[PDB]
Structure 1
Amino acid sequence: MQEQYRPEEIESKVQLHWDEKRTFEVTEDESKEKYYCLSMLPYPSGRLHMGHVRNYTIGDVIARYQRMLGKNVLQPIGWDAFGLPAEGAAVKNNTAPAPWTYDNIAYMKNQLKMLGFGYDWSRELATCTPEYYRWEQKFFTELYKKGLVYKKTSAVEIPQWFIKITAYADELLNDLDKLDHWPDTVKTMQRNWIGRSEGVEITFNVNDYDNTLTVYTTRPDTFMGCTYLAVAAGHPLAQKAAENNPELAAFIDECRNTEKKGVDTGFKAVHPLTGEEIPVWAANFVLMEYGTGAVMAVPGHDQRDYEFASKYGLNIKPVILAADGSEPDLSQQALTEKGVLFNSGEFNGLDHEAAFNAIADKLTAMGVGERKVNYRLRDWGVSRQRYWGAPIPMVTLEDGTVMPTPDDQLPVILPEDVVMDGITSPIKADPEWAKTTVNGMPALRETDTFDTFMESSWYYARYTCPQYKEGMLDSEAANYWLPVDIYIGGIEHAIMHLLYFRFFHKLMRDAGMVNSDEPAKQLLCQGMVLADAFYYVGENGERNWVSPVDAIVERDEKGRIVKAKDAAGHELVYTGMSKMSKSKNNGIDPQVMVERYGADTVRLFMMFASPADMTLEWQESGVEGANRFLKRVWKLVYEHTAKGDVAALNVDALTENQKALRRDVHKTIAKVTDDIGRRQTFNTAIAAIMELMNKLAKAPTDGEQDRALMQEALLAVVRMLNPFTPHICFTLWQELKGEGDIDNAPWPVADEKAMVEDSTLVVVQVNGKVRAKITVPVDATEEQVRERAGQEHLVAKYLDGVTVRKVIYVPGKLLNLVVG
């Protein structure tokens, strides 16, 4: 062995072994239990950030641990490669988006390798390649024929392609119930986003108006509180009035260049229950796109109605009682909560549910109302007027009929050799590209490209069979691996990507491509990486943000930054730990850290400093501790193997000291296993390993037996540490002369017999307060425990002239003397 740990001498050698042996490449093997461990695929922006490194370290820890458990593990990697940032960059550089992207892919890929992430590289995908995106093109045309795709003019205002996600709203909603291993926060977020609403539509007569007006409400129980109606600016009635109302016309237009504003239509509606005439306004807070584009305003009870009403001097009216039985104070604001009705005629004293239903029945029966479900979820807009994305496989024939691009004209290849006049898509500015021909007779092909959410909605499934032509998926491959066992990414994608891929999975199931309802069993959302942030105020009053690496802090009595400076000698203020930014200038580059300390150090810190799902505060000094630890592990292994082979261990003959140490070894194995496998508290896992290593370094290494126990302990630690720091462990495994490559060594299992105790610790309380800890035989009787607790001066002096009233005893744990 070499005396120095030198990651530079070890990491690339091990990495190259992994490529040469294709260690992490896997097939669909039915004799083994599968495990699919998936991290969210990176966008090739140019270089990895600390988010990626934390995300992929977590995945890799799991993937490696699961392999050592004897499972067949898929850990795939890929590139979500279309998108906007390349178009602006092709521009700011000489280049085109494709070559820029491929350059970025190559560079980041080399970074992922230097971190020793054990991916199956034979499954690598880059989504901007025809070999990938042809398949979403083919699937689009299929979805079209299914009745799930349509074209529509709509606001953002332009013609767009939509996929009908609303057709699966109730499945997307109900199936949240099957996802116990998704975090609540994410689930709630998809509920809210779907926004399933049970309500009542209520139609009014209007006075000098030859139609009726319908509103949608979720609170029909408050109907008697309705003092006016609000209609969206795009409402037919508001546009009607606006012909003879110059001021209204102004408003139907000020609602584009975008807190309450409105204009009176002049129209009076007739409330159906009261006969009372009420005013219709156009209001800026009424969505034309949801419900009916109009509301019954109840300002006593909805906050937006309240603010609109008191700003335009409209009647506010209380109709729901206070929580406590009393009439409510509406002087400040709307009273929001459901409660008992008053001020509502025949409906007085009814509570929310009984009232909802009484007032709906009555209105249904007068023929001016009906129950109604609405959804906040709108259909998914998939077209972009952008160049860098998959072309949309649709065609307009010269006669005017739209249809899918024919199967023999697929894939519709987007061309990569282009010049950017960076403001028109090269496939738009040249009028030849659009030109094509179907069945003879000329045709114009679509020029919009896919929303980039389109590639990231199905990649996880394509990883199962990435080289399969003949189909989007190989169903036997896909069904072997799916569903994903753990999916690891940020919580920010909750109602975008996390929703699209569930929807797409069900799309693929319904085309007979997969046989399961949901794509992923567990979602783990890893916290943010934060760094320290500093700034000085310049002569001009402007805040200049200084990188904490450039910061020079000065502690105090006890640690505590009391004053800091940069090299220019500016006075810095410390704002704490915060999200990493360009604004705040506090980004840490993982490449610098990987090259400073080695990857194992960087990984070990990332996994140690904080639980997967809590924020992680980057510290250089914590990183350096992780580095020093690896050196202490290296040293111990070196001093040990320097002495050569060991005799076989003899378990029956060990000292009480030797037995205690061996028991710490196997208890650690048990705790580390539980913490990684079941709890997923990787930081406490690592802490147990360190705790154990501190004890090992202090143990004797001279006798045949001491040395054999060390051999065992080291072989166990090196495996336990391997999912976090594979390069150093792979190496030390060899040095210790373990069987084969560490990547296929079995996860250590704790030996039940080694964990048995001969003695135990019993805490003695006197009236509930500790006064001693005693070591008694493991099987001492209660009487023996009381007698020995008594012999302890530390106890016996809280038993002087005072008498034991009763005693509480938990076998082998606690004796509580109640006194006295």
Structure 2
Amino acid sequence: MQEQYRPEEIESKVQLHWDEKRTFEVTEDESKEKYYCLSMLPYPSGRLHMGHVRNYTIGDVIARYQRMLGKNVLQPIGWDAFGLPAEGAAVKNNTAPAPWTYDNIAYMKNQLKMLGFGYDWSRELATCTPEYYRWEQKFFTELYKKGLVYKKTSAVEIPQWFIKITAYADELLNDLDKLDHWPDTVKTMQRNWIGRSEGVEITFNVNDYDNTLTVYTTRPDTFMGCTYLAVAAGHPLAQKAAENNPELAAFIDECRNTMEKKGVDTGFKAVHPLTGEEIPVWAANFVLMEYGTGAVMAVPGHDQRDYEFASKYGLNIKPVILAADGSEPDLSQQALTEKGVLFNSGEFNGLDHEAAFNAIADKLTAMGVGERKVNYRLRDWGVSRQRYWGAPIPMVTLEDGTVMPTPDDQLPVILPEDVVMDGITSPIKADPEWAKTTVNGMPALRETDTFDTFMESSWYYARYTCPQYKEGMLDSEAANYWLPVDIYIGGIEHAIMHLLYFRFFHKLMRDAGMVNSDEPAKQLLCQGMVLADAFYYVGENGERNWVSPVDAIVERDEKGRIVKAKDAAGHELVYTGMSKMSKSKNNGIDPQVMVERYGADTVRLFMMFASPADMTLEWQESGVEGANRFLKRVWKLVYEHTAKGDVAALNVDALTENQKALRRDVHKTIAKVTDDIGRRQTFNTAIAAIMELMNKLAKAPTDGEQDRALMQEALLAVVRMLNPFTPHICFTLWQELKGEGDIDNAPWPVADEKAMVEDSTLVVVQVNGKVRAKITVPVDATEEQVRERAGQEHLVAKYVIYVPGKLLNLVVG
């Protein structure tokens, strides 16, 4: 064994080993309990960022640990490889998106290997390869034939393919109650984004208008307070009136471009269905065209938005709901928003909210001018992009003008990778020959738009279970073996997009017979952002210039706080504190630099120690150095121990009191570390516990046979406890220690519960809650015996609650 720990001589050899032995490749073994550990797959931008390293280290820790518990562990990796940045990069450079992407994949793949993440590399996927996207093309055609896909023009004013995610809204909402092991914050974000709403459509007659006008309200109980209607700028009733009306004309145009209320009177009168009175119809900026019918009824008395509109434009404010105490409401300043009993409403006077809502809804429904309507804030999923670098949409327009999917025997529709980008138009649109095809004996033009990249990331988790299956999108027996994902790790920024889509997609696959389960992932862990110090100076021109923390010459006060800072050019810098890493703040830290500086193990250890997985981590070079010194101390202790050669078998009966208590701490540490990693997922305190035992072990004597056999037990346990964090050093150390086999197949240490019996316990004696004594009594002892002993204590003598083997308190009388 070398005296000095040198990661450059260890890590790349251990990584080769893992490749040659295929250590982390797994099959569908029914003789083992499966564990599927998944980290959000990276986009191949070119280099790993510190957020990748954190995400993937957390994942690797769990995967390695669960393997040592005896599970069959799937930890897959791959590339979300389509998307916008490759188009830009291709143009800036001399190239095309495909080769730029594959070059990045190779470079980033090597980085991941150099960090030593135990992936099953046999299951590696690149989502821009036909072998992957072909299946989402087939799936889309099936969705279309099942009526879940449609085309329409929308404004984000382009025609688009939509998938009917709203057909699954109720279930996506309801099934959140099954997600006990997802964080409340993500669940609440999904609830709010779905935005399920119960209400009533109310249809009106408009006097000089050809059509009826329909509005959506969540508050039909306020309908006798309706003094006008309001329509979106893009509503067709507004477009018609705008022909004669230049005031309205310019208002509509203004609303397309560039929380104040703004409106113009349309001139149209609508007939209130209950009263029969004419009310006016205004165009208003606060009514979204895309939600509900794009038209509301206005009740200024009780909708704050309608209050400010009516107050601005002089329209009537009419009170129809009473205040909580039953008194008529104060409308002189704002709307009365709370639900309450009706007045000023004829039939419906005296009805409380629920009764008013139903009575009015029922009356309108019976008159044929209302119906209950459930809307969602959730929009249908627009999946088409006017971009080249994405999977082609498998749809076609025959010369008929008729539209159908690309036939099965023409799938996949392959994106040609050999292209020159003019930077302006997609190559597959620019070449007019590419679109031309023949379908069903007929000439046709195939879709030129491509899928948004969310399409690929919505199902990769499942394809990892059968990456090479050629028969279908999924092999159901393999998918159901592995799914649902046990833990999914990745940032909270994905909560309302990817984290929703993949649930939807899971449910689509379920409903196609493809998978067995309702939800894709049991636990979601959102790891916190990595932060770094940020500095800037102000130039002579008044512009801020951000300076990398590496380049800051800082001056600290007596207590180590930064009190002044300069760069080498002499610029006075202002320290802005720990912040999110960015190219704009110029404070990003390159993990490759840190891996080459300290070794992958040091970087992994620091990232798992500095902070709880779900909280922000502050990058501190002094912290990384601390981690580096710790591993050197661990290396050092194994080097001195093994230098003394083989050890006798440990004899637990003949151990000394000192030896027994040291052993007890080894085993108590095994228990705590097991619980922190396995149940609490508090990795930072797990490492802390290992550090604390190491400090004790560095002081233990190692000359007697029994001392050396104990140390052997301890070090073999420590090397295993650390292995999920720092597997390169632990792989090597295990061998040095003559452990059986490769550490990766070694069993996780189990605490020997005979070694943990305490004999005595400490008890804190308090008088009026404040500690006066600390005393040692057996776990064996009865309540009297503990107070008897307490009473014999002389500082207790100068001055009744009991917790066994813990505390005794005396309220003074």
TM-score (norm 1): 0.96
SS of the residue corresponding to residue 574 of structure 2 reads strand
Q: Which moved more, 1:440-449 or 1:469-478?
A: 440-449
Instruction: Kindly state the Cα deviation for residue 316 of structure 1 after the two structures are TM-superposed.
Output: 3.1
Structure 1 residue 85: deviation in Å?
A: 0.3
Q: CA-to-partner distance for each residue in 1:696-735, whole Å, 9 max, x for gaps? A: 1122112111111111111111111111111111111111
Residues 346-404 of structure 1 deviation map (CA, whole Å, 9 limit, x = unaligned):
54444322322232233334443222211222221111111111111222222222222
Q: 1:571 to 1:328 in 2, by over 3 A?
A: farther
- Of 713-722 and 253-262, deviating more is 253-262
Matches of 2:139 and 2:194, distance apart in 1:
24
How many Å apart are 1:82 and its aligned residue?
0.6
Report deviation, 1:147.
2.0
Which range moved further: 787-796 or 493-502? 787-796
Percent identity, aligned pairs only?
Answer: 100
Which digits, 9 at most, give the CA deviation of each residue in 1:528-579, with x for residues without a partner? 1111111112212111111112112211121211111111111111111111
Task: Tell me: CA distance 1:94–1:372, structure 2 relative to 1, closer, same or farther (3 Å).
Answer: same
Using a 3 Å threshold, how does the CA distance of structure 1 residues 608 and 367 change in structure 2: closer, same or farther? Answer: same
1:104, distance to aligned residue in structure 2 (A): 0.5
Q: How far is the alpha carbon of 1:341 from its aligned partner?
A: 3.6
- Is the alpha carbon distance of 1:209 and 1:111 closer, same or farther for their aligned partners in structure 2, counting shifts above 3 Å? same
Q: Deviations over 1:447-493 (max 9, x none)?
A: 11111111111111111111111211112111111111111111111
Residue 526 of structure 1: CA displacement?
Answer: 0.8
Cα offset for 1:332?
A: 4.9
Deviation at 1:440, TM superposition (A): 4.0
Query: How has the CA–CA distance of structure 1 residues 463 and 333 changed in structure 2, closer, same or farther, with 3 Å as cutoff?
Result: same
Q: Would the alpha carbon gap of residues 321 and 663 (structure 1) be closer, same or farther in structure 2, given more than 3 Å must change?
A: farther
- Render the CA deviation track for 1:218-267: whole Å, top value 9, x for unaligned: 01122233232111122232222222212112222222224322110122
d(CA) in 2 for partners of 1:10 and 1:131?
36
Q: d(CA) in 1 for partners of 2:514 and 2:367?
A: 50
In structure 2, relative to structure 1, the CA distance for the partners of 1:704 and 1:437 (3 Å cut) is same
Matched, 1:564 2:571: no
**How far apart are the structure 1 equivalents of 2:636 and 2:339?**
68
3-state SS of paired residue (1:652): coil
For residues 435 and 371 of structure 1, what CA distance do their matches in structure 2 show?
A: 47
Cα distance change on mapping 1:661 and 1:345 into 2, 3 Å: farther
| Residues in 2 aligned to 1:457 and 1:239: alpha-carbon distance in whole angstroms | 39
Matched residue SS, 2:667? helix
- Partner of 2:522 in structure 1? 521
In the TM superposition, what whole-angstrom CA distance separates every residue of 1:625-646 from its partner, at most 9, and x where no partner exists?
1111111111111111111111
- The more displaced of 17-26 and 331-340 is 331-340
Would the alpha carbon gap of residues 211 and 387 (structure 1) be closer, same or farther in structure 2, given more than 3 Å must change?
A: closer
Gaps of 5+ in 2: none
SS at match of 1:436: strand
1:67 paired with 2:50, answer no
- Structure 1 residues 748 and 765, CA gap change in structure 2 (3 angstroms): same
Bigger mean CA deviation after superposition, 367-376 or 645-654: 367-376
Counterpart secondary structure, 1:36: strand
- Matches of 1:52 and 1:354 in 2, distance apart? 55
Alpha-carbon distance in structure 1 between the residues aligned to 2:444 and 2:693:
73
- Secondary structure of the 1:19 match is helix
Distance apart, 1:212 and its partner CA: 3.2
CA-to-aligned-CA distance 1:270-328 (integer Å, 9 cap, x gap): 33444554321011221222211111112333232233222223333444444555555
Change in CA separation of 1:419 and 1:33 when aligned onto 2, cut-off 3 Å? same
Per-residue deviation, 1:441? 3.6
Q: Distance in 2 between matches of 1:397 and 1:208?
A: 41
What secondary structure, in the 3-state scheme, does the structure 2 residue paired with 1:571 have?
coil
Provide, for residues 391-430 of structure 1, a one-character-per-residue CA deviation record: whole Å limited to 9, x for no partner: 1122222222222222222211111111110111111111
Change (3 A) 1:212 1:414: closer
Aligned to 1:810: 803
Q: Distance in 2 between matches of 1:210 and 1:436?
A: 43
Q: In the TM superposition, what whole-angstrom CA distance separates every residue of 1:139-163 from its partner, at most 9, and x where no partner exists?
A: 2222222222222222221222222
Question: Could you say if the C-alpha distance between residues 397 and 113 of structure 1 is closer, same or farther in structure 2, counting changes exceeding 3 Å?
Answer: same
Shift of residue 331, structure 1, vs aligned partner: 5.0
Query: Could you say what secondary structure the match of 1:795 adopts?
Result: helix
- Higher deviation after alignment, 522-531 or 61-70: 522-531
The alpha carbon displacement at 1:72 in A equals: 0.3
Q: 1:244 to 1:616 in 2, by over 3 A?
A: same
List runs of 5+ in structure 1 lacking aligned partners. Answer: 799-806
Decide whether aligned partners of structure 1 residues 108 and 333 sit closer, same or farther in structure 2, where only a CA change above 3 A counts.
farther
What are the Cα deviations for residues 595-653 of structure 1, in whole angstroms up to 9, with x where unaligned?
11111111111111111111111111111111111111111111111111111111122
> Alpha carbons of 1:692 and 1:335: their partners in 2 closer, same or farther (altered >3 Å)?
farther
Could you give the per-residue CA deviations for residues 28-71 of structure 1, whole angstroms, max 9, x where no partner exists?
11111111111110000010111111110011011000000100
2:354 alignment partner in structure 1: 353
CA distance in 1, matches of 2:709, 2:617: 39
2:248 is matched with 248
Secondary structure, aligned partner of 1:22: coil
Please report how far the alpha carbon of residue 690 of structure 1 lies from its aligned counterpart in structure 2 after TM superposition: 1.0
| 1:407 match | 408
Distance apart, 1:504 and its partner CA: 1.3
Equivalent position SS for 1:653: coil
Residues 568 and 71 from structure 1, CA distance in 2 versus in 1: closer, same or farther, beyond 3 angstroms?
same
Aligned to 1:38: 38
Q: 1:118: Cα distance to partner?
A: 0.3
Aligned residues: 812
Range with bigger deviation, 134-143 or 11-20: 134-143
Question: Which residue does the alignment assign to 1:388?
Answer: 389
Q: Secondary structure at the match of 1:243?
A: helix
Q: Deviations over 1:496-547 (max 9, x none)?
A: 1111111111222222221222211111111111111111122121111111
Taking the aligned partners of 2:302 and 2:310, their CA distance within structure 1 comes to 11
- For residues 507-656 of structure 1, the aligned pairs below 5 Å read 507-656=508-657
Distance of aligned partners of 1:718 and 1:340 in 2 relative to their CA distance in 1, 3 Å threshold = farther
How has the CA–CA distance of structure 1 residues 210 and 162 changed in structure 2, closer, same or farther, with 3 Å as cutoff? closer
- Deviation, 1:338, is 2.7
Q: What are the equivalent positions in structure 2 for 1:75-86 lying under 5 Å apart?
A: 75-86=75-86
Q: Judge which range, 584-593 or 377-386, deviates more.
A: 377-386
1:193-208 → structure 2 map (5 Å cutoff): 193-208=193-208
Q: How far apart are the structure 2 equivalents of 1:455 and 1:534?
A: 39
CA pair 231-773 structure 1, distance change in 2 beyond 3 A = same
CA gap 1:214/1:401 in 2 versus in 1, 3 angstroms = closer
Query: Structure 1 residues 543 and 282 mapped into 2: Cα distance closer, same or farther (>3 Å)?
Result: same
SS of the equivalent of 1:651 reads coil
Look up the SS of the partner of 1:444 in the other structure. Answer: strand
Q: CA RMSD in A?
A: 1.8
- From the superposition, tell whether residues 709 and 429 of structure 1 become closer, same or farther in structure 2 (CA, over 3 Å): same
Q: Name which of structure 1's ranges 354-363 and 749-758 shifts more when overlaid on structure 2.
A: 354-363
